[PDB]
Design a protein around this ligand. Structure first.
Ligand SMILES: *SCCNC(=O)CCNC(=O)[C@H](O)C(C)(C)COP(=O)(O)OP(=O)(O)OC[C@H]1O[C@@H](n2cnc3c(N)ncnc32)[C@H](O)[C@@H]1OP(=O)(O)O
Ligand SMILES: *SCCNC(=O)CCNC(=O)[C@H](O)C(C)(C)COP(=O)(O)OP(=O)(O)OC[C@H]1O[C@@H](n2cnc3c(N)ncnc32)[C@H](O)[C@@H]1OP(=O)(O)O
Lengths: 331, 332
């Protein structure tokens, strides 16, 4: 039972390494130490040993590496690395001596420079601002035209989706996707779903309309995205426009949506905009009592995930596990 | 059902009259028979008497009034009214004659001109065909706003909303409402909610943002719609922009929207557009197990309601009752 227990039992086998820059926060050190007791990941604590000494009390962070930006033996490599990408903005060479003191920035760069598989922060830092440094240093992947935030949504006592589990996107970051984002989000989401849920993605591109039923500007920015998509990733099951019932309910799909590759079996939900995306996930979580995991970022070169201002050592452990499974994508 | 049980019993004490123009469908007659038996409404059957009786069988329709558009007292008045209503659109006197021979058109006119309180149709007939006359003839209450479509949404084992009961709008009809449309749907939805559910409305103008947590044209529109609504109806509890969790989860409301007159106890959800509105209702119904009632139309000067292909005679009975309660906005 449970997305996250499955995810961490797979991370235990991937042997990925994640950086944790928030070493002046307690729950982070609890995570590291739990992470290592369980074999979920090797870990690098970007921080300060003296500071961490009187934070990690009855905890064993021995197995974990400790890296200090202002001491660490490749410091000037990381600074050179940073200045080169950011120099286009009129930022000086020593101004990389700023920014690259941030354990966050330092952590993110270790990932880029191959020294780590991914990074997880944002526990008491800031939830829009882990993304910029991730964007500054790492940026998008390959067939990733953009990025995205998705949620995993597991509905209890549920038969629809992948035994109750869906990916919803974008439900967390991208506010007004174009026809071409909704496109690219659909494709990235299918691969993300597939890696993380280990089931065949069947993508419903959601609307108030089911293939024909209504016609407006919105409906036109959907069928469009369906068709663009159906054609970037032709081996992928994609279909639209589909209402939620057509998408997941077969007996409805068997009137509204005959011969659909997805209608009736959908397990990925792609939303027109973040109003729809966010509203929908919250309704799933709060009214349908779904467990929601996210926001999780997709489409970056290395997985860098941002946390929530109020969550537990046990949550951070799980975020790290998810990131490990994401890093498996590029093996 | 339990929403619909309370509505049905209210209907009995309200003594309203409802036209049922869909007389060539026996569901309509089975409903109308149960409606008169149960004392829910008075009924006008628009249609041919011979034909209606023939088809009735042993249904007790003796307490219903039958009205023939081809040979009713007020035919000519109704026709001239429709011409007057509509001549500015090219409709001629001759056109008006023919268009008002329609039983639905004729029923909606009966409501406009006071001879009935409301109309229910559309069970084996497209909606656009119930809503076109509704909107052409009866039109919007005062001169204002627009007709919109709401759902009553009842989530089981839920303490949020009004014991798990919500109104969602617009989740079935208006596709791309302007800022003003959204503002009007908020005010009208609040009144609909208070009437039908009988609890104090707490209206959340939904968004992915709560009270400044993000900023886009999506968010500026929700805020604009929120503030106009607050001018339109200063005495209604209306807040925005609010995410859903802020709208209904007291603990989230406290950090995201402290001091809100709505956040944490929202019972009315107002959607940016029909993508959001429809996707939301469908997820509530399909994934949260909620019983959904709708689409029901609000904002008309008189309550006209359109059914759907798969209604039972009981589903129609219930809709009549719903319409009787919507018609008691007048009463007081
Ligand atoms: S650490 C474990 C916390 N619990 C969970 O992970 C369970 C699922 N998460 C949630 O229920 C919600 O995310 C919580 C944290 C309970 C509440 O979230 P909010 O409603 O405040 O915010 P949203 O879920 O709508 O997400 C948007 C907010 O998240 C931050 N953010 C934006 N983009 C990202 C990405 N890509 N990755 C991580 N965080 C991200 C922003 O702060 C954003 O807006 P706020 O100003 O914080 O409201
Ligand atoms: S007899 C009880 C009817 N059903 C219920 O009350 C249960 C809740 N409603 C539903 O499950 C759905 O409403 C049904 C009809 C089963 C499924 O319809 P869709 O899934 O295709 O459509 P939506 O629910 O998204 O509703 C929009 C449709 O309804 C028609 N319509 C527009 N505006 C109105 C108003 N104002 N009143 C009644 N119906 C209205 C639209 O035409 C649209 O498509 P149609 O094919 O014509 O119904």
């Amino acid at each position: 039972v449970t997305f996250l227990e499955k995810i961490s039992e797979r991370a235990k086998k991937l042997n990925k390494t994640i950086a944790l820059p928030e070493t002046e926060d307690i729950r982070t050190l609890q995570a590291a130490a739990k992470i290592l007791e369980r074999g979920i990941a090797d870990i690098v604590l970007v921080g300060n040993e003296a500071d961490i000494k009187a934070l990690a009390g009855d905890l064993d962070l021995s197995k974990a590496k400790i890296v200090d930006p202002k001491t660490y033996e490749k410091k000037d490599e990381y600074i050179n690395a940073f200045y080169e990408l950011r120099k286009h903005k009129g930022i000086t060479l020593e101004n990389a001596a700023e920014i690259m003191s941030d354990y966050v920035y330092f952590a993110v760069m270790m990932a880029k420079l191959g020294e780590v598989d991914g990074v997880v922060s944002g526990a008491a830092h800031s939830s829009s601002d882990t993304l910029r440094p991730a964007v500054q240093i790492v940026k998008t992947a390959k067939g990733a035209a953009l990025a995205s935030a998705f949620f995993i949504i597991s509905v209890p006592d549920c038969e629809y989706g992948s035994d109750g589990t869906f990916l919803f996107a974008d439900s967390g970051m991208v506010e007004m996707p174009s026809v071409e984002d909704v496109a690219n989000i659909a494709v990235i989401s299918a691969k993300t779903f597939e890696l993380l849920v280990q089931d065949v993605p069947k993508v419903a591109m959601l609307s108030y309309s089911t293939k024909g039923s209504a016609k407006s500007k919105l409906t036109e920015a959907t069928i469009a995205s369906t068709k663009l998509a159906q054609e970037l990733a032709p081996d992928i099951a994609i279909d639209g426009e589909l209402q939620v019932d057509a998408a997941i309910v077969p007996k409805v799909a068997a009137s509204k949506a005959p011969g659909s590759p997805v209608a009736g079996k959908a397990n990925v939900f792609i939303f027109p905009d973040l109003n729809c995306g966010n509203i929908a996930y919250k309704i799933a979580q709060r009214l349908a009592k779904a467990e929601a995991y996210g926001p999780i970022t997709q489409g970056l070169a290395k997985p860098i995930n941002d946390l929530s201002r109020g969550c537990s050592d046990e949550d951070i452990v799980g975020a790290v596990a998810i990131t490990c499974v994401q890093a498996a994508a590029q093996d």
